[PDB]
Amino acid sequence: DAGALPTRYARGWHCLGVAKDYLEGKPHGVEAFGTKLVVFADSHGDLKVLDGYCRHMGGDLSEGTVKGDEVACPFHDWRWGGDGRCKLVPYARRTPRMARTRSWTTDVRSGLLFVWHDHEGNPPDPAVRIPEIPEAASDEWTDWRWNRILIEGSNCRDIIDNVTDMAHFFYIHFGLPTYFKNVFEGHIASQYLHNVGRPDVDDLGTSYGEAHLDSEASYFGPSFMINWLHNRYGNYKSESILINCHYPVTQNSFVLQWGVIVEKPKGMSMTDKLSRVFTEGVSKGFLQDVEIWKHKTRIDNPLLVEEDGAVYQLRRWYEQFYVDVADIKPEMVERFEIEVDTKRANEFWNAEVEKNLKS
Amino acid sequence: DAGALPTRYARGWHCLGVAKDYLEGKPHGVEAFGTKLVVFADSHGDLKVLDGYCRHMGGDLSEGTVKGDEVACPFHDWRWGGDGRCKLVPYARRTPRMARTRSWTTDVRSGLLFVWHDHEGNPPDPAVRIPEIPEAASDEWTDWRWNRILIEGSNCRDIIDNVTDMAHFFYIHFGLPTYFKNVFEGHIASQYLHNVGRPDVDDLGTSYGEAHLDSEASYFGPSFMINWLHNRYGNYKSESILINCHYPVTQNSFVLQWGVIVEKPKGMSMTDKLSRVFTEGVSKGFLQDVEIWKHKTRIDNPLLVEEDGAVYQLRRWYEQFYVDVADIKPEMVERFEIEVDTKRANEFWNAEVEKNLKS
Amino acid sequence: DAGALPTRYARGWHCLGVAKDYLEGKPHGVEAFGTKLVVFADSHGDLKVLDGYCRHMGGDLSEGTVKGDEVACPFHDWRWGGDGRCKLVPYARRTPRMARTRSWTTDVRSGLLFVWHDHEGNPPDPAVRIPEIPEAASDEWTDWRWNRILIEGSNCRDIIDNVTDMAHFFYIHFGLPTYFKNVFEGHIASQYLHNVGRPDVDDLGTSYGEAHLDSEASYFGPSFMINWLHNRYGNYKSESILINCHYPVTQNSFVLQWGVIVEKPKGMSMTDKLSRVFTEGVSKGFLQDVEIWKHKTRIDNPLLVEEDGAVYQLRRWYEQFYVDVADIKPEMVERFEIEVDTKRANEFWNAEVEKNLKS
Ligand code: FES
Ligand code: FES
Ligand code: FES
Ligand SMILES: [Fe+2]
Ligand SMILES: [Fe+2]
Ligand SMILES: [Fe+2]
Ligand code: NA
Ligand code: NA
Ligand code: NA
């Protein structure tokens, strides 16, 4: 190899997408966690998730209908509540007593739908709830532009390695990482970055390329990352938020999603034109990661240099989600920090940048 | 789960389709029973089935030719009789002596081709021969309109559960089952039905919907069902026969077939126009089952109500085909009958029908 | 069955195609031997092969670039020499010391690229080097017209059985084998053939069909065959060379390739017109084998007649490549010859040829 497959899917919150796309006003089928899931909303507009296959004789609940607070199976119309309780068998003398299917705990946060997953079958620790993003509810920000792809032939765990790599900021995103720090603690892993645009990549000048980016990116649990993007072109500031999230479909396939909201420029003219530019731009930055992730294997026992930083400590952090809560080791979870020195690399890269535009 | 896969394919007769489609005058390839099969007719027009792969060096006999009473392998022209005997190697000094491949016992019944399958390798019990349908040879009836699909991702055993379910007649076929009885005995499982058209499903009236259907449906062995359809619209009677049959390709894929013949209306004008309407109509009734079967799992340990009827007894009946003939249990095979009470359901359903057209 | 899958890929030289197609001047991805391979040339134009996945964090080297004598990984630009040595990590203070990936020994012979494979991980025995074909470097011959297909659902070992079969020359290639001899010795298996065109296959005459073909075909190791084709139409001689070669992708899939060069006719008129006819013609002869190979299984325990010749001795020869060099048995490798008597078959076939054109 590199790498024996996980035997479970990770314990945590997984984002299924934009909440308003699961509300129309039918059930939705999602394949996830090696099964099929049914997603549907209440008569109160509250979102529920169940095993997708009817416990009676196997009808696909996602092919059925919402009737009041229950999804009705397409086959014989039995009625399943968001808590999994069989509420009614319409034509029967006696609805089964205290029957239920598996229900999944759900959370709507920042206009996004999350489901909880735990192999051990325990409910969500309140301590690991996904944070609200205030700007998702601001009329001063755009609303989620959201994308999703299916990646086959790898495990979702392959993509989290990005948290820890300073050097790809140059080769993949075409900037110069001038500051690089990782923090792991509890259920959160973070990356803090200062990045400068490269002069040799067509937005130079001189005196007219020169974006500076300050980035904080955090994983809140195993699968969901918020990235706060503050960049500048001199004195022109722009603010954005990129969501990088995934959920496993299989141990060899997963859905990768990304969303972007931007602080609307005031403005102007509508000003939608310029927000599309800001959005498509963060989107293209994400898509440069996808190109790599799409054509790469995971390396279980990597050849590492000092500049790799905290690769092992990050993999140790991520293990916590795959062990029973009772088996979590201090060192998975205790505060770890590392600043990666980017000064030699930056002098090498500036030399290569210089070398390139001397032509 | 629901359900550990069978380790054998069922012992019995399996229909391969309309006999006249296997007669033209070449061999035919069929994948079935986890292998490849070759089908071909005699110089007497008698139909034979063999393992499809030549015992010499593996040529695909279905890619070859019929020469007299033998199929000639495309590779080196060896000649295989319908009983599996190597009859000739044309260029050789000495044809192998008492060499053979596996041959499959065949039956042409009602213009349909059947092959026999038994894991134990024993020949067909005469007691289980598939019955003749006289109307398949009547010029007073239409001839087989026949359809076939490949279902991937399930086992063929999933579809036989339909024999025992009264309630889908309402939700799936949009009628009201007014009488419902099952009989299992020997190698045959039967369903007897009286069904009334629903007023809320656009053929009402009042006084102008109102079909009454009397249905007898029997499985003759594991895979082949004849359904006798007698319905009325007042005094206008119509007669039809639906064949529901399948054969396994793999333990996770099978071919589902259906054929319909109708009693031709006298007539009239040709009268082909009206026979097409009668045929397409039974066909669409079958296709409503297919929609369910296409998007459903089998439930091995189902949540059952009283109205489910004889679900366990039917699964016990079907087991007989998967055990060695010597291991068949009395209770698989002894006469079992159940009438399912449809009176409460029918009052519930009439209320819902009433509720619907009050709008 | 027929046949338990090999547990290794064969020890020997495998042809990857025309060397000039791997030189342009980027790396190439090839799937082979159950992995992914990267192919690239030097700054000296010398061709190298490595494991395709970067040992750092798994980037696909075939998606990267050639920089001097090394392929640069697309992910972080590490630099890998044709011998597998990590030569530089560009941005790092310290390149890893004495780090390497797996490199594959390479050979350019007759304008074709070969890679060496050995489960035991030993280098190429000089004794088994693939011979030069002088005519591949002659301006009196055409240059490689080359074709490649992917065969899924079989093992590459299935096709080598052709070496030993006289009778397919009639049924598959439509000629009459008048002389047939096999020689196995060491790492080489050979077929010597005299073939006459069939009168009943539209190039008769009389006095105007009547090609005579003298053929020598040799496997040099497990996967690569040169076939020298000398045929005549009376006094008009033509010379060609067909390469039949393959490499395994998986134990159930492989790439089959074929190339043809012809002695250019002098000439004439350009004379390219006639060389295309000669080439397309050998190509179509090869393609008649492919039709069989595409629709056939391997038979592990075949029903054989005397006319089958040395089927077992050929399979025993081929075993050598699948055992450890230390475990090769005398009888795999010692000189074996057999002439197959084609006289009775030829009288049978002439009778059938006669029978056919009497119509
Ligand atoms: S299968 Fe769901 S109601 Fe019967
Ligand atoms: S493979 Fe069937 S005749 Fe040789
Ligand atoms: S993955 Fe190849 S250089 Fe890092
Ligand atoms: Fe990135
Ligand atoms: Fe039905
Ligand atoms: Fe051949
Ligand atoms: Na790093
Ligand atoms: Na029922
Ligand atoms: Na032979």
| CB of B75 shorter than 6 A to ligand 2 | yes
| CB of residue A102 inside a 6 A radius of ligand 1 | no
Domain count for chain C = 2
Ligand 3 site residues (CB inside 6 A) read C 54, 56-59, 73, 75-78
- Domain boundary residue, one of C114, C142, C170: C142
Assess if residue A16 is contained within a domain.
yes
With contacts defined as CB-CB under 8 Å, which chain C residues touch B60?
295-297
Alpha-carbon distance A20 to nearest alpha carbon in chain C (angstroms): 37
Residues of chain A in contact with residue B170, where contact means CB-CB under 8 angstroms, are: 91
Residues contributing to the annotated binding site of B for [2Fe-2S] cluster: 54, 56, 73, 76
In the Cβ-directed half-sphere of A212, how many Cα atoms lie within 13 Å?
Answer: 9
User: What is the residue range of C14's domain?
Assistant: 8-142
| Residue A161 and residue A138 share a domain | no
Place of tokens 């159940």: B338
Instruction: Choose the residue to mutate in A70, A78, A79, A101 for probing ligand 1, maximizing ligand atoms within 8 Å of C-beta.
Output: A78
A247 burial (CB, 10 Å; 0-12 / 13-18 / 19+) is buried
Same-domain check for residues B147 and B30: no
Residues B157 and B132 in one domain: no
Task: Name the residue facing A299 among C55, C94, C95 (closest C-beta).
Answer: C55
| Start-to-end Cα distance in chain A | 43
Decide: helix, strand or coil at residue B297.
coil
Q: Is residue A2 part of a domain?
A: no
**Binding-site residues on chain A for chain B (CB distance < 8 A):** 53-60, 63, 74-77, 86, 89-96, 99
Question: B58 vs C306: CB contact, 8 Å cut-off?
Answer: no
Torsion of CA C281, C282, C287, C293, to 10 degrees: 160
The Cα A92–Cα B341 span in angstroms is 11
DSSP at B129: P
CA of C288 to the centre of ligand 9 (A): 17
Q: CB C76 to CB A295 under 8 A?
A: no
Size of interface A-C (CB pairs under 8 A): 70
Contact (CB<8Å) A299/C74: no
Is there a single domain that holds both residue C162 and residue C310?
yes
* Among the listed residues A134, A165, A147, the one whose alpha carbon sits nearest the alpha carbon of residue A228: A134
Indicate the residue of A158, A171, A306 with minimum beta-carbon distance to C76: A171
Q: Does a structural domain hold residue B2? A: no
Q: Is the CB of A150 under 6 A from ligand 1?
A: no
Residues C112 and C203 occupy one common structural domain: no
Domain boundary among B120, B142, B164: B142
Euclidean distance between CA atoms B342 and B167, whole angstroms: 9
Structure-block tokens of residue C140: 């009196």
Ligand 1 atom 4 nearest Cα = A76
* C149, C130: one domain: no
Chain C residues within an 8 Å CB radius of B54: 299
Where residue A185 sits, what CATH number does that domain have? 3.90.380.10
- Residue C66 in any domain: the answer is yes
Whether residue C1 lies inside any domain: the answer is no
Domain match, B151 and B138 both: no
Pairs of CB atoms within 8 A across B/C:
70
- Does any domain span residue A1? no
Please, what's the b/e burial string for C326-343 (b: 16 or more CB within 10 A of its CB; e: otherwise)?
eeeeeebbeebeeebebe
User: What are the φ/ψ torsions at residue B288 (nearest 5 degrees)?
Assistant: -75, -30
Same domain, yes or no, for B251 and B313? yes
> Is residue A148 located within the same domain as residue A138?
no
Domain edge (last residue) among A142, A170, A185: A142
How far, in Å, from the CA of B191 to the mean position of ligand 5? 11
Distances (CA, A) of B111 to B21, B276, C199, C219, C278: 10, 20, 44, 53, 52
> Computed over its alpha carbons, how large is the radius of gyration of chain B?
23
* Ligand number nearest to the C-alpha of B286: 5
**Distance from the alpha carbon of residue C54 to the mean position of ligand 3, in angstroms:** 6
Among protein residues, the one whose CA lies closest to atom 3 of ligand 3: C76
CB pair distance less than 8 Å for B56 and C302: yes
**Co-location of A247 and A118 in the same domain:** no
Nearest by CB to residue C305, choosing from B53, B60, B96, is B96
Residues C275 and C216 in one domain: yes
Resolution in A: 2.3
Q: What is the CATH number of the domain that holds A75?
A: 2.102.10.10
Does any domain span residue B164? yes
Write the CA distances from A35 to A46, A227, B1, integer angstroms.
Answer: 22, 30, 10
Query: Residue A309: left (phi > 0), alpha (psi -120 to 50), or beta?
Result: left
Whether residue B210 is found in the same domain as residue B231: yes
Ligand 3 atom 4: residue of nearest CA: C76
Kindly report the nearest CA distance between residue A52 and chain B, in angstroms: 10
Would C354 be classed as within a structural domain? yes
